Amino acid sequence: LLLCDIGNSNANFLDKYFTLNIDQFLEFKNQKIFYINVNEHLKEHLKNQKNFINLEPYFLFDTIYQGLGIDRIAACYTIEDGVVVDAGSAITIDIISNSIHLGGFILPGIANYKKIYSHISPRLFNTQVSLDAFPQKTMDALSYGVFKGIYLLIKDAAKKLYFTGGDGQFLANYFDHAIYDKLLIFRGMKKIIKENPNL
Amino acid sequence: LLLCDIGNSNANFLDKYFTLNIDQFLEFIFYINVNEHLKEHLKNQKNFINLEPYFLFDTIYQGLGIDRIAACYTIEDGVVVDAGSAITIDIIHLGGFILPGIANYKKIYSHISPFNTQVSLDAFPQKTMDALSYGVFKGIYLLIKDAAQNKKLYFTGGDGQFLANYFDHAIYDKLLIFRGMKKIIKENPNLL
């Protein structure tokens, strides 16, 4: 059972979890691969690979959010009630209540915060910065700005929390009653398959 | 008496307030400067007199920028927010924190994907531009609120009035920085 979650920078596979970059992904050959894809650039390519089978059409998900990404849908999908946070290149926060998508929002990913500080000034992280004291040096002034900004947005939006993505465990640790599941999305994909076994 | 607050995107002048962008300032005076790539050019200019070494300001914060010092210089008690290229939030000095300015939030998103300022903050967005706008505006809002846990609140800077509107009990002063700069010329009559 080979699953593929395709992004703008990475394709994450599950068989056993691995990550390829996009060049690597384009040279991959294999057996059936089930997939979701947000990369607009790879749509023609995927259509030419007959072994590749798009799960997106099977996702029924109650939202009015225009153009919601299939990646966010798939991560919300096994959740009945809760706040879903996928912390990678971007940080998306989605709110589920009663299997209904109430809305959601987007933040830069942590690496990107680091890039924009640099673009602003060479004068402009400590992951172990405290959130309950004002910072006293510039490293901490940045780390606090970023990490506390995300902490408060998520606190306000949240309800149980589910976390996923490369930075998800780190963000989860600021909260009690929160889970981290590296495989949230692949669980949504797993669920689609258990619901349409003719696949 | 001509004053200049030279920042990372803009040069705020007071002769009559008015602002140049950097590329303008270059083709354009007591000053403070946080623009690294402008250090050289300023030493070149003999009409410009740096005011930074005259400030004496107690803080337990190491390497506090001179724009923050200057903004904070005339405030006995409160949170001081300066919203430009970056947004500095300072406490009266018991510390403070920094964010990207609103336009620099734009720039990350615009590069990734080549703002709605009236976005509601009390409901969850349902389209991409609103999703972005709310992450930015509410993130800033929650941080200041949390920091100003009841203290006074002061805002300045090019985007400072916009942000002040989010608040009851808050004051915007476009000139808070030049007010530090004037108080320094005050304390140092010798400068004239």
Curated annotation (Swiss-Prot), chain B:
Q: Which cofactor does it need?
A: NH4(+); K(+)
Sites binding ATP sit at: D5, I6, G7, N8, S9, N10, A11, N12, S85
Q: Which InterPro entries match?
A: ATPase_NBD, Type_III_PanK
The name of this protein is: Type III pantothenate kinase
- SUPFAM superfamilies tied to this protein: Actin-like ATPase domain
Give the organism the record lists: Campylobacter jejuni (strain RM1221)
Q: Where does substrate bind?
A: Y61, G65, I66, D67, R68, T128
One CC-aspect GO term: cytoplasm
Q: Which UniProt keywords apply?
A: ATP-binding, Coenzyme A biosynthesis, Cytoplasm, Kinase, Metal-binding, Nucleotide-binding, Potassium, Transferase
Organism phylogeny: Bacteria, Pseudomonadati, Campylobacterota, Epsilonproteobacteria, Campylobacterales
MF (Gene Ontology): ATP binding; metal ion binding; pantothenate kinase activity
Task performed by this protein: Catalyzes the phosphorylation of pantothenate (Pan), the first step in CoA biosynthesis.
Q: What is one GO biological process annotated to this record?
A: coenzyme A biosynthetic process
Known catalytic reactions: (R)-pantothenate + ATP = (R)-4'-phosphopantothenate + ADP + H(+)
The record's family statement is: Belongs to the type III pantothenate kinase family.
Q: What is its EC number?
A: 2.7.1.33
